[PDB]
Design a protein around this nucleic acid. Structure first.
Ligand code: MG
Ligand code: MG
Ligand code: MG
Ligand code: MG
Ligand code: MG
Ligand code: MG
Ligand code: MG
Ligand code: MG
Ligand code: MG
Ligand code: MG
Ligand code: MG
Ligand code: MG
Ligand code: MG
Ligand code: MG
Ligand code: MG
Ligand code: MG
Ligand code: MG
Ligand code: MG
Ligand code: MG
Ligand code: MG
Ligand code: MG
Ligand code: MG
Ligand code: MG
Ligand code: MG
Ligand code: MG
Ligand code: MG
Ligand code: MG
Ligand code: MG
Ligand code: MG
Ligand code: MG
Ligand code: MG
Ligand code: MG
Ligand code: MG
Ligand code: MG
Ligand code: MG
Ligand code: MG
Ligand code: MG
Ligand code: MG
Ligand code: MG
Ligand code: MG
Ligand code: MG
Ligand code: MG
Ligand code: MG
Ligand code: MG
Ligand code: MG
Ligand code: MG
Ligand code: MG
Ligand code: MG
Ligand code: MG
Ligand code: MG
Ligand code: MG
Ligand code: MG
Ligand code: MG
Lengths: 93, 46, 271
RNA sequence: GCUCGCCGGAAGACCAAGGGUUCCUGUCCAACGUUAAUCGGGGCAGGGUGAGUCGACCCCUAAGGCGAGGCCGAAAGGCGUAGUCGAUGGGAAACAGGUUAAUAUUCCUGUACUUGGUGUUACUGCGAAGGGGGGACGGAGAAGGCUAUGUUGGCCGGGCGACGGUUGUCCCGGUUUAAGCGUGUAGGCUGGUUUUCCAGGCAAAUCCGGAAAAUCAAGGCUGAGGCGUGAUGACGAGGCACUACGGUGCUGAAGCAACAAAUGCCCUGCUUCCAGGAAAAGCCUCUAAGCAUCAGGUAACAUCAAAUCGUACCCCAAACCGACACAGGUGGUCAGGUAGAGAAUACCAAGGCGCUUGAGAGAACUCGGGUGAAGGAACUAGGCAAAAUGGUGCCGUAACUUCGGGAGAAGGCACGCUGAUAUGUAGGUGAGGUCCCUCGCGGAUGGAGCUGAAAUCAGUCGAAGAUACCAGCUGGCUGCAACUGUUUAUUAAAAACACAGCACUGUGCAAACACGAAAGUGGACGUAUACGGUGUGACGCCUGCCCGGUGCCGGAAGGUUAAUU
RNA sequence: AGGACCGAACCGACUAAUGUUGAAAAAUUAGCGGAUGACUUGUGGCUGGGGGUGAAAGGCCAAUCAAACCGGGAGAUAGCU
């Protein structure tokens, strides 16, 4: 099994948006910010162990950082990973 | 009119990339000169 | 046979073709095939070292037994096939033990004829014997220079070699170029002339035919500037020079052979 | 929102490259946009890219690169063996419907498929760094069978018309469904089997190759499409009811047949030609060392796994290459209607646009076009430009000629619509039904229905019927180059270069020659019917004299002559 | 069958006009040539400067070519302006 260290490090934040709300209300899917090098197996194991819920499947994607400008200063935000983890229809987290 | 610069990332990396500069001692001297100058970008690699 | 084409177009008006209906219309024997990519006259430095080579039709190499070092097993001629890599036709022969080999087809060969290699082989075309077991005055091809190295002389279509005299451990040969040469009597030779003798009767007819064979156009040296050929320059047609190579060596009559190592085996020059 | 105009083999849609947030939402008009701006590819903030099956990664290699040792080189280094990388190529597997403001073959539904690991059971000879098969291959041509798709009829829903007519041979719209599974067809390829022996496949092999016997003569391999299922499902013209006026929910008829038909599929097929047309792995098969009532293999079942990265958006362009929101350039895929041979062209469909300054006036002059009295090259360096010709079928066509051409030589006639031949013909397709047989996607017959040129005769309208777009000017003499091609990117396309052919000359293979301090490499895995250099330049008739000069080839009596001694 | 014929795509570039501080540091418009081949094109690779490549124009080698570009000898030298 994956150690408690990775399972406590991989999850970062719960994503919030209209799409996330729609997914949580229709498909029993919660959207989370996870570690950049967190695999789907680690995400699933951490969601099961740290939330006491039951997971069906995990979908991941990397969000690219947006180039910005802080008053003529070029600056790029950091890339991060988005997780679409689906529960087994009876968890209602 | 077909101009002279036809971009191709793979060809760019193969011709002027970091590992192409490190493959010969003259490329290594190119990297040393650029490090001495203080360039913020040694190669076209990134 | 040689066939004159009909002048339905300017490119066909002069084409003379060589067609043998006895050549295998199918595919070559697969296990005796290899790839040979084209050089283009470029050496391992990437520079052109032989001019006027490039393009042409894709070709696969047919492995040909120039050594003929299977003594005592008879073989039968299966079929004659076209060979892109040479001017002569090659023959599929089947040895008694179930072994298949490619040989240069001599004149008069046909499917169903037998061949044999060895000291005791019968003197007849297609049979390979050491030249100390081959009579004087006979016609041979695929002649060896060093015992076991392989045939290297009289290999082109229609070419042959005559054994003119025998003495000691060497035998004299009259090469197709005309010179008299000495070779060890242990070297093997194949009886008979190489086939496809009509190969020199063909006419390409057009520039494209020459381009299909890997040849690129030749530019006359007098047609360019002096910066890149000794023959260059002039206002109009002007020569006023002794003809030379593109590198300055006189190219009309000057001998260029220099090999003292092999001078002892040349009885007479080709004259 | 209603009209008008433009593209529609693109100015529509989708991949690749390249770019990187330009994509969607709210907000703002300082700067940017060649004008204004409430608008924006502009500013600010937020949101958006979901994969076991797509691509990368991965296994395998091409050209080529790097290259342990090695060879060579003042040093730096060069070449290269064993290997290892290298796609533009080979290798497992997913389709249809629905959903967002922005993603979908990735989310949801339905129905599938692939590989690998384990465990249980059953049977059992497994095993590679090796052998064999296969993967696995060109150009052109033709036919047959299909499909995408289209048209028409039938069916279902709706309609009865702002102006004369419109219950009918009328008008409008819809008539759609995949992968997978089963069947194994039109078609192509090939004799099947069972023994025995063997100088071959580095050793061996039951495998491949060879040989000899008997035996049966139909077995095997491949293969579009069609049909059943998938699917009593989905979708579906509309309708009902709301509305935050963008849209949203429920319900839902018919969903057939005939004909035509691809450049797409069968097809890596077949035929033919010479210029003779990758590699390796995955895959199948054999065994060696080894293990041998343990492993391992096969088969059924069950369970587990398929990770990581990309996925927004532009993509013939305002986002890529051109300093620009630049009349330029940019590889591949899709391919409706009428007319048409056509992907030409004209007008349209789906779809997308009116090109980021306008408003007036109606001078010269400039640019792009239309027409023109009489004349018709008188212009001019020159018919430059313009004008003119232009289709199909049929008749007809000279000198010359290398007998192929010239030739579309020249020149001429017909062409629209209607009716009849014939309620639509010759022809194509082809159902029901009759019979038969290897029983099925079968064979003979049968001709319903659909479709359907070209011709003849008669009539008829206009000035004109190849009516628009589209679409050769022709002939005669003559120089040069035989011809097709190539060239001064950006003032020269030609008589110049090349060319097939000819000749001379060199070269015997460790070839000549060329690139290289060298090792090596090309020439060439070629061998004098070959290769290199030079000149000429199809073909026909031909190519005459001079070796004194320069060069080259051969010779070595004599003269002279280096280093050396 | 054909370096065959007519003719789109595609590849080019013969004529004329426009443009010449251009829409464009080589284009547009109307005509024009080849269009199954010595064809064209995508991707990747190789040849390096007295060198490459060149169906040969001293052509091309990143809008530069009778000797590329960048840096260095270097403040070359200049009886000249
Ligand atoms: Mg993903
Ligand atoms: Mg830059
Ligand atoms: Mg040559
Ligand atoms: Mg020649
Ligand atoms: Mg010249
Ligand atoms: Mg010179
Ligand atoms: Mg003169
Ligand atoms: Mg003179
Ligand atoms: Mg921005
Ligand atoms: Mg304002
Ligand atoms: Mg403004
Ligand atoms: Mg937008
Ligand atoms: Mg914006
Ligand atoms: Mg999924
Ligand atoms: Mg290699
Ligand atoms: Mg190397
Ligand atoms: Mg070493
Ligand atoms: Mg590899
Ligand atoms: Mg690839
Ligand atoms: Mg989208
Ligand atoms: Mg159909
Ligand atoms: Mg075609
Ligand atoms: Mg997209
Ligand atoms: Mg604009
Ligand atoms: Mg543009
Ligand atoms: Mg193009
Ligand atoms: Mg058009
Ligand atoms: Mg006016
Ligand atoms: Mg005017
Ligand atoms: Mg006019
Ligand atoms: Mg007039
Ligand atoms: Mg008049
Ligand atoms: Mg007149
Ligand atoms: Mg006059
Ligand atoms: Mg005058
Ligand atoms: Mg004119
Ligand atoms: Mg005109
Ligand atoms: Mg009529
Ligand atoms: Mg004259
Ligand atoms: Mg000519
Ligand atoms: Mg020019
Ligand atoms: Mg020109
Ligand atoms: Mg050699
Ligand atoms: Mg042609
Ligand atoms: Mg050109
Ligand atoms: Mg044009
Ligand atoms: Mg022509
Ligand atoms: Mg043409
Ligand atoms: Mg000149
Ligand atoms: Mg230039
Ligand atoms: Mg110089
Ligand atoms: Mg100095
Ligand atoms: Mg100075």
């Amino acid at each position: 099994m994956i150690r408690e260290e990775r399972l406590l490090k991989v999850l970062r934040a719960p994503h919030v948006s209209e799409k996330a709300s729609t997914a949580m209300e229709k498909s029993n899917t919660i959207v989370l910010k996870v570690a950049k090098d967190a695999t789907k197996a680690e995400i699933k194991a951490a969601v099961q162990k740290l939330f006491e819920v039951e997971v069906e499947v995990v979908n991941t994607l990397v969000v690219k950082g947006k180039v910005k400008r802080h008053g003529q200063r070029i600056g790029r935000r950091s890339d991060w990973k988005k997780a679409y983890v689906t529960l087994k229809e009876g968890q209602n987290l | 009119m077909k101009r002279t610069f036809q971009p191709s990332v793979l060809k760019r990396n193969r011709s002027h990339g970091f590992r192409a500069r490190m493959a010969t001692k003259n490329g290594r001297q190119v990297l040393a000169r650029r490090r001495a100058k203080g360039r913020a970008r040694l190669t076209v690699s990134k | 046979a040689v066939v004159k084409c009909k002048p339905t177009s300017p490119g066909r008006r002069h084409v003379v073709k060589v067609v043998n209906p006895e050549l295998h219309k199918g595919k070559p024997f697969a296990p005796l095939l290899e790839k040979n990519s084209k050089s283009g006259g470029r050496n391992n430095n990437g520079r052109i070292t032989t001019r006027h080579i490039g393009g042409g039709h894709k070709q696969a190499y047919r492995i040909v037994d120039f050594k003929r070092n299977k003594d005592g097993i008879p073989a039968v001629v299966e079929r004659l096939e076209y060979d892109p890599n040479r001017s002569a036709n090659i023959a599929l022969v089947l040895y008694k033990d179930g072994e298949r080999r490619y040989i240069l087809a001599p004149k008069g060969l046909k499917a169903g004829d037998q061949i044999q290699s060895g000291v005791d082989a019968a003197i007849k075309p297609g049979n390979t014997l050491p030249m100390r077991n081959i009579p004087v005055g006979s016609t041979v091809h695929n002649v060896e220079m060093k015992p076991g190295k392989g045939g290297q002389l009289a290999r082109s279509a229609g070419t042959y070699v005559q054994i003119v005299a025998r003495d000691g451990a060497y035998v004299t040969l009259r090469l197709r170029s005309g010179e008299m040469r000495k070779v060890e009597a242990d070297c093997r030779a194949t009886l008979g002339e190489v086939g496809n003798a009509e190969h020199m009767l063909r006419v390409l007819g057009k520039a494209g035919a020459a381009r299909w064979r890997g040849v690129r156009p030749t530019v006359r040296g007098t047609a360019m500037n002096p910066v890149d050929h000794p023959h260059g320059g002039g206002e109009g047609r002007n020569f006023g020079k002794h003809p030379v190579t593109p590198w300055g060596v006189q190219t009309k009559g000057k001998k260029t052979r220099s090999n003292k190592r092999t001078d002892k085996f040349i009885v007479r020059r080709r004259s």
